[PDB]
């Protein structure tokens, strides 16, 4: 046997992140502000890249999963926490988008608890 | 400006119902074309209108007739259809609200009498 290769596969935790955690969040009513990277020019957002130096969004997390960018579920959880905290840092605490982020994070934390 | 049975209906039934709808919020206040980065908005929309302005006009007895209030709704909805693409999300929101608008207006009292 010259080449004992086998097809690339995700871990059970990474498969869970994709088919359960992200699927559930993407379907949530308040997830749509998090589908794409923040466009600070289009959205007229002062100082966004000055304050938020590691941008993250669910579209990027989704695609990193579908393109096998991740090698461990912990990296995917870190991207999710970066997404939520960026939104908490930049916006005012009473802003709707923060309450939306908080609602998604609760479901995220609840789903990660259910994980193997 | 007057208080009428029909304008009372527009304030206490039509606006009340529409304001609570899940898709009503983009219509709560005038479009701020500078803040939202829509630099062509006022070259395309000559007569802005929004449901917050309608609500205040009802509250300040601005209208002489519910006919004028309904025109304001028509202006708000058709401004949205003109400015935006037929597949934009805000257009589907406007269509949902206009559908409820139509069902409430159908039950408006047919004769307008001043209070």
């Amino acid at each position: 046997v010259s080449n004992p290769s086998k097809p690339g596969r995700k871990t059970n935790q990474l498969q869970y992140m994709q088919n359960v955690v992200v699927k559930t969040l993407w379907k949530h009513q308040f997830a749509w502000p998090f589908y794409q990277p923040v466009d600070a020019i289009k959205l007229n957002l002062p100082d966004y890249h000055k304050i938020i130096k590691n941008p993250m969004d669910m579209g990027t997390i989704k695609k990193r999963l579908e393109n096998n960018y991740y090698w461990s579920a912990s990296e995917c959880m870190q991207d999710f926490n970066t997404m939520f905290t960026n939104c908490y840092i930049y916006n005012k605490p009473t802003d709707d988008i923060v309450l939306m982020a908080q609602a998604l994070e609760k479901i995220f934390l609840q789903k990660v608890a259910q994980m193997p | 400006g007057r208080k009428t049975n029909q304008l009372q209906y527009m304030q206490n039934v039509v606006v009340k119902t529409l304001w609570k709808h899940q898709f009503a919020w983009p219509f709560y206040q005038p479009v701020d074309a500078i803040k939202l980065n829509l630099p062509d908005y006022h070259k395309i929309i000559k007569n802005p209108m929004d449901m917050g302005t309608i609500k205040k006009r009802l509250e300040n007895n601005y209208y002489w007739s519910a006919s004028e209030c309904m025109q304001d709704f028509n202006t708000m909805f058709t401004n949205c259809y003109i400015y935006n693409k037929p597949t934009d999300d805000i257009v589907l929101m406007a269509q949902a609200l206009e559908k409820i608008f139509l069902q409430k207006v159908a039950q408006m009292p047919q004769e307008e009498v001043e209070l």
Binding site: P33, K42, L43, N44, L45, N91, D95, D96, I97 | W25, P26, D32, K35, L36, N37
Partner: peptide, 11 residues
């Protein structure tokens, strides 16, 4: 407000 509108973001 504005940011969600952009409407959500700008309240």
């Amino acid at each position: 407000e504005a940011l969600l509108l952009a409407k959500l973001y700008h309240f």
